Amino acid sequence: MEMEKEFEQIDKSGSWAAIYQDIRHEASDFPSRVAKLPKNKNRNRYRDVSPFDHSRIKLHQEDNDYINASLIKMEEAQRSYILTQGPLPNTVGHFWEMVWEQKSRGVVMLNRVMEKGSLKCAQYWPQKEEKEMIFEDTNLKLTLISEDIKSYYTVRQLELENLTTQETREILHFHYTTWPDFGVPESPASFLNFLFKVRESGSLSPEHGPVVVHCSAGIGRSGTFCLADTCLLLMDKRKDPSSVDIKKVLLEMRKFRMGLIQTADQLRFSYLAVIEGAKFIMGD
Ligand SMILES: COCCNC1CCN(C(C)=O)CC1
Numbered sequence: 001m002e003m004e005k006e007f008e009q010i011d012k013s014g015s016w017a018a019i020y021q022d023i024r025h026e027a028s029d030f031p032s033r034v035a036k037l038p039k040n041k042n043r044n045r046y047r048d049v050s051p052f053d054h055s056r057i058k059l060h061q062e063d064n065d066y067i068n069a070s071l072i073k074m075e076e077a078q079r080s081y082i083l084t085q086g087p088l089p090n091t092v093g094h095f096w097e098m099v100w101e102q103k104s105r106g107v108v109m110l111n112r113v114m115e116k117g118s119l120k121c122a123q124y125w126p127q128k129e130e131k132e133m134i135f136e137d138t139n140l141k142l143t144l145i146s147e148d149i150k151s152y153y154t155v156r157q158l159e160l161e162n163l164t165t166q167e168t169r170e171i172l173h174f175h176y177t178t179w180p181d182f183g184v185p186e187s188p189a190s191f192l193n194f195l196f197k198v199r200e201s202g203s204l205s206p207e208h209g210p211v212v213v214h215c216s217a218g219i220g221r222s223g224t225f226c227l228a229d230t231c232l233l234l235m236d237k238r239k240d241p242s243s244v245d246i247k248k249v250l251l252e253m254r255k256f257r258m259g260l261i262q263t264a265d266q267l268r269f270s271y272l273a274v275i276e277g278a279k280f281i282m283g284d
């Protein structure tokens, strides 16, 4: 079925939970043996969210190459994403090592450091120009260059220096700051505006390594971001845009990381975002 009318049909019939449970039942199951080794326990935020072995990002280190991060490679859309958990106190150096080694231009953050009164990720970037951060375990230096605070999101320019080689690179930090502590946003307008700002920066384009996107577990809000981006790109590429099937795209993405889209409300919100976005791209 088309999307917008499939959408109203699920709303009128109140069957979002059943649609979402079907997706959960059909999703891929691949091994995640490296994530479950005892030496990696303090590298995982949640015991039930792990990268598959076949798609995990490897650190360029011979001691321990493990990070909780996955490469999502979308062949028809010609887009790749790295989805990862929010960094832990003992993985902030690994996180920036990954950004460096994978040649990423941008980092997309969809959570606040504290939500619901609890810490959802480490404070992993500097908050003042004159107070830079050094990660001694991976030999990297990180400096805040500029910060632009807007009503729904903040964009930061950061300098990452490999202290071994003295090479430097400019990294863009796109921070969506207004996702509610509970539930999903009422309108997708600010989330779509944010997606378009990431696109306009070059951070999603083939002349760079894959964008790094995270929330707390790296599967819920993060899954919504890449699902909406890929569906909109496919609607632009194909002769028949109504052929794009958001459930089929989501199951394809779940071949590369488990659990993408965590609730039926997140699934409905993803539909809403793609539907509204497809009108702005053109003219209705
Ligand atoms: C004087 O301490 C400088 C610490 N630089 C960074 C600060 C952020 N870090 C954590 C674990 O939160 C990792 C080390």
Ligand SMILES: COCCNC1CCN(C(C)=O)CC1
Residues within 6 Å of the ligand: 002, 235, 236, 240, 241, 242, 278, 281, 282
């Ligand atoms: C039955 O018609 C459904 C049309 N789907 C539309 C077709 C045009 N689209 C775009 C993005 O050009 C969005 C999807």
